[PDB]
Amino acid sequence: SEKYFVKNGQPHFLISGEVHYFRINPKLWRNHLQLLKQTGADTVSTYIPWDWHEIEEDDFDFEGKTHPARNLIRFIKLCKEENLDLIVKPGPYILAEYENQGLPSWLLKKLSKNAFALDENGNVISPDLVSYLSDEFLEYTFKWYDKVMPIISKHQKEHYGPITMMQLCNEIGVFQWLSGKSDYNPKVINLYKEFIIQRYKTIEKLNSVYSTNYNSFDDLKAPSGKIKLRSDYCAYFDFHLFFREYYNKYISILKNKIRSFGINIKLTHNIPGWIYGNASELPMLISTYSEIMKNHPDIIFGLDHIPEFVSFRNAHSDLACNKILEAMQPEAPVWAAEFQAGTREHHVKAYAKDLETFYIASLAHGIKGFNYYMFSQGINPEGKGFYGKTFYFQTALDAASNKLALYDSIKKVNRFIRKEQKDLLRTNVNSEICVGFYKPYFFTELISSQLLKEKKLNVEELGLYIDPRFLREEILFNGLLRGLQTLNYNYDVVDLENCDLKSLTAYKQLWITSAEFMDAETQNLLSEFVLNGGNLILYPAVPTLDNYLNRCEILKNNFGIEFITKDSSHKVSAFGIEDVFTAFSKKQIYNDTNSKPIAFTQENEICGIRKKIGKGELTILGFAFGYTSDEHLELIDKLVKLNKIKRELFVSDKDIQFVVRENNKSRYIFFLNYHNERKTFNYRKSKSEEISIAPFSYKVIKENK
Amino acid sequence: SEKYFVKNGQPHFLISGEVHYFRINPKLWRNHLQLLKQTGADTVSTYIPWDWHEIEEDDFDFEGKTHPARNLIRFIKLCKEENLDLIVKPGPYILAEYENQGLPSWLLKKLSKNAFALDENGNVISPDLVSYLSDEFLEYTFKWYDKVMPIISKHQKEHYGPITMMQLCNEIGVFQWLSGKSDYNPKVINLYKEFIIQRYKTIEKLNSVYSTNYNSFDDLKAPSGKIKLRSDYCAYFDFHLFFREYYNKYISILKNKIRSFGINIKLTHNIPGWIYGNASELPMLISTYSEIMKNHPDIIFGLDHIPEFVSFRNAHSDLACNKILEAMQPEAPVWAAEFQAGTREHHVKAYAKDLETFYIASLAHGIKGFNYYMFSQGINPEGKGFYGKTFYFQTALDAASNKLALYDSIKKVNRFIRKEQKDLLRTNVNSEICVGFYKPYFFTELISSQLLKEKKLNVEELGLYIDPRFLREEILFNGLLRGLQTLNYNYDVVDLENCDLKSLTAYKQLWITSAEFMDAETQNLLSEFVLNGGNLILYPAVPTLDNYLNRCEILKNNFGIEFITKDSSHKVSAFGIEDVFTAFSKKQIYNDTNSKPIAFTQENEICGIRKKIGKGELTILGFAFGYTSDEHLELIDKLVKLNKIKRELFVSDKDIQFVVRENNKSRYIFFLNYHNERKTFNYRKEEISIAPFSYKVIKENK
Ligand SMILES: OC[C@H]1O[C@@H](O)[C@H](O)[C@@H](O)[C@@H]1O
Ligand SMILES: OC[C@H]1O[C@@H](O)[C@H](O)[C@@H](O)[C@@H]1O
Ligand SMILES: OC[C@H]1O[C@@H](O)[C@H](O)[C@@H](O)[C@@H]1O
Ligand SMILES: [Ca+2]
């Protein structure tokens, strides 16, 4: 059942700490490694910066001949001497608050304009932002790999070295995302045109899908500018599919290059998306990796968690992200490649009290491994800091190797993990609720995001009213997922793409947050799910279009639903809850045929029904709610209770979060107080026990079954 | 010298609680009022919703004839019986998460298209958003005033009644701001044309300023779409000046109508701008009231503070907003018309332990009065809630008058306030730093804001690189003001408009965050300031343009400055601090004749100088830094120390914030812990422990 890392045929919690040799006095490297090992950590992790080691074009130093902290070889040897396994991350990009994101200054001065990401006008977006498939960029990247990869290969575990894992590049697409502009480099334009010709084969076939009138493929260009017609939406949809293939081509090229050096260790990649302490856009960025995860079962993706604080304001972000990684990568453990320790920026504090709670909450939320980022502070040598001289603050160790407050928090957490890992790693929560992940709603990084400078998608111009980004942020991430976690109902997330019917029928309920569009394959899957005995909850819309916004009424027809879309007050009544505020004036009005009406508009028109279809049950709500009122929690709770799903515990304070993890031998009860209140409460399993929990604090109770 | 409310001829801290009679079971009105009074509160505050009382056109109920909670008259009687003064807020707009923002449904169903705020295409922006100077809207507003104002007039403090203050409308421009669109209603456009003719007199004068090619004012159109040309910037700038006159015309029309009923109590207005627990846009919104504040010294503006939490993440917002209100309104107390109690949003928690600290921090930060918003929760009657059934959560009292956790926090704070008010209200901080407030940098709500749906202002299209909203948000509000607060250096803010030279001379340093444009009057003011002996810190640019982007180099020439704008790495060195991250590649590179170079690019070009001019001192930095590294705090500290300015205390833990407030005989030291850490420290001009997100106040007799 559970996915976890294994060592010596036993479950093993991966505990790594990030220690940047290049930012630490090499006379203190050993002390940093000893103090990390003394916390119970098994692994150390570092970037190997291209700029740091290719000091001028074709002049390499890995031995500290020109600066003692260029002695990568000695750092590798110390990791082995201090019995730590090593994760190496040689880029080409590292980010790492390093000048030019780790690319050499000499490189960026030499590269031609066509090596850079370009805007719609052909202008350079940023002087450190390359176009990934640039011939010149990949030539210099390969020359870098030619010098660093033999060193990595020599020091792998299979040659009795400490190196067990290597990250390829760093958060692919993060630089493009943060710039707020997409890449229109000519390599992108030309590879896109090849993609479209391969995809459609004839211009007649493309025109039939898009409803365009092109005479030839030579008339068609990568889409630019705002979406005004459904044909512009179609063009951008394919452009999103293309970018997923483009990032798969990039990582495939790096992987094939590294394998040529005899490097057989585990390859990793790291997922961006937290900003200002929440992760509602992370699902968009993880979706850009869809083709990499389909084609490379041997690259393990891990999350980059940057909570910044730990409170009800962001409590749901880490669990939703952990669940969405599991959905997209169900055969590998859920791990954090970067797991916040300290703060990347002086003005954004990172308190030990918060992060210690985050670490325990992460265990509650199913994490199987992590890399404390940053375990060790660094001091940039030679002006290499992007933003200042000091690299991170409020870490476990300062750059000198002094213990800071966070060290004691990590020791406490790691001690618990080491004591419990053989049982805890094998535990699961009992999820009776499955939530669908429909990746195409996330495919909007070119047209609609929190970071994109230009809003290119306005669905009203297309005759639609449900924006897929509004749906996936407010109705799903901040809405349903936040609500279920707040209500202490366990859920799983399943990727609906090529999804096995047998993997949905384990759940008492499947929840689908739907826009007006959904592909035929997914409409058919949800149809079969209900006909064969599944219980489906679907809102705010029965879809009637496919991903190209062409007619597709499969689910509507299979479920025998008739509806009209009508304007009314935002407030509806649902299951006897009055004044439920909904997101839209427009609602689906269902006729009551062979159904029980359960939701009504202010004019008493039917906007939600329940029915029995084949061996299954359907609940459809023709209105949108996330979690912006107490009525929304009441409605989620009522929906869950339709199939008699029960919480694992009765807890006297509804603002206490809990998670029960168990196997045949052991039960762990995690209590999380995400609130600035001392809470005294009682609980019992579904004679009560009393607990007092401080503000922003945790309790963990272990029972031997 | 301090400004404060007065009761019984003594300094009086205004402690008001918001209690919406229209959202409370009338059987429990007395119980809510008694529980509010038992916290030591002196005043209760409420809207009087137009929709609630004009139940159909020309059918008024203020006596509970049709619903017991329409008995406004009984509520007023209970306030008197329970010895509370009353603040009333009859609109016409109330917002208050009330359907139609408090306008009657029957009114919105009946109004013509031309009564509504319209976008660039002539479409209605929102079915509850009227154009303020709509004739139809003012006709019906006046008929509402005709019924509610005689009731207020009878019960006003000038007739020895309980009503001490009345708010006119609610956060003027807030609906416009939140809609993300500006009003192009044809009456508004006609008033804008009248405003332009009044301002320029002749089309030749307007053409000389804008570089336009009109033959007459008949050719003139309201600016729309993106700014591509400097002439489009000019038209939008005057469109901003016009909206400030427009809001003054609206509030003048309401005030004159109110005064006609013999209402001579204090009139108020309330300032919006907090969102997601910070207030970096509130200075833009307060700038929209510039003409109201200049023309109506009898209308007291108060702040609507919505911190949501209390930590280092938002510690600087309330101080900066309080200081900006003081700059724009120096002759009235700084007070919060809405002072967060509970939460408007169930999913956005408001912890009693957070807000208790916010209340004490607000005292440290110079607040003189406030209105707990919401003291009492409400239940929306008859589906009249904009949102769900319940109005506010985690308040002092629930809608049934049950005491909640916040009640005891408010009782505690109120007891400290009543014990200390006579001395505390007469205290000020000793500011030796003044920070300039240049209002034109804030006049962008039509073209650039956090809420505007399309950015119309792209300064690179105008041949500029310093965006005024970036400057005022990241370099000023979240940069310099946050850094000074964090470093525990007192500052004052001064409005540079019509500013007295005499008012700047008391300060040891004037800090000016400058874009490439600044009007002649302000350039002249800053020139005279330094020549006469003042010490000026100016960055990131010596301005070379006026507000119409026409050449204006008064300050530059008067100070003998020469520069070239050149591209370099973002990092500079300044005062021996290496690796100072700056916002722009473009920097001013100064000629150093008769100057001391003090900052350098990565290629060692001079991007900052110090100089003696007349009797004074100039420090100019040709680069933009906010607060995103420890080097930024070090640079601000180095700059303050150029004129030997000292903190009032030595505190062993640099992450403890303090404010020293004094008068001739009393000192209050407010220690504030904005961090999730128990901190132990000592202080001197003596060892204290403060819990996470908490406070300690110390008194010292002088
Ligand atoms: O916060 C925005 C982004 O900043 C980047 O520097 C981090 O590497 C990402 O993980 C993060 O999502
Ligand atoms: O077990 C001791 C731990 O208890 C938790 O409840 C607290 O949040 C931690 O601050 C503390 O280290
Ligand atoms: O948060 C955005 C705005 O919301 C409005 O409902 C409040 O009345 C304002 O004070 C506030 O700034
Ligand atoms: Ca000169």
Author numbering:
A (entry chain B): 6 to 691, 698 to 716
B (entry chain A): 6 to 690, 700 to 716
What does the primary publication say about this deposited structure?
The IALB_1185 protein, which is encoded in the gene cluster for endo-β-1,2-glucanase homologs in the genome of Ignavibacterium album, is a glycoside hydrolase family (GH) 35 protein. Here, we showed using recombinant IALB_1185 that this protein has glycosyltransferase activity toward β-1,2-glucooligosaccharides, and that the kinetic parameters for β-1,2-glucooligosaccharides are not within the ranges for general GH enzymes. Kinetic analysis further revealed that the enzyme has wide aglycone specificity regardless of the anomer, and that the β-1,2-linked glucose dimer sophorose is an appropriate donor. We propose that IALB_1185 be redefined β-1,2-glucooligosaccharide:d-glucoside β-d-glucosyltransferase as a systematic name and β-1,2-glucosyltransferase as an accepted name.
In order to understand the binding modes of ligands, the complex structures of WT with glucose (Glc) and Sop2 and the complex of the E343G mutant with 1-deoxynojirimycin (DNJ) were determined. When a crystal was soaked in a solution containing Glc, the electron densities of the Glc molecules were clearly observed in both subunits as the β-anomer at subsite +1 at almost the same positions as the DNJ molecule and the Glc moiety of Sop2. In contrast, Glc is absent at subsite −1 in the complex unlike in the DNJ and Sop2 complexes. If two Glc molecules bound at both subsites −1 and +1, the 1-hydroxy group (β-anomer) of a Glc molecule at subsite −1 and the 2-hydroxy group of a Glc molecule at subsite +1 would collide. These observations suggest that binding at subsite +1 is obviously stronger than that at subsite −1. In the WT-Glc complex, Arg349 participates in substrate recognition to give a stable conformation, whereas Glu102 is still disordered or flips out as the ligand-free structure. Subunit A of methyl-β-Glc, Sop2 and DNJ complexes, and both subunits of the Glc complex adopt the type 1 conformation, which is likely to be observed if the aglycone moiety of ligands is absent or small.
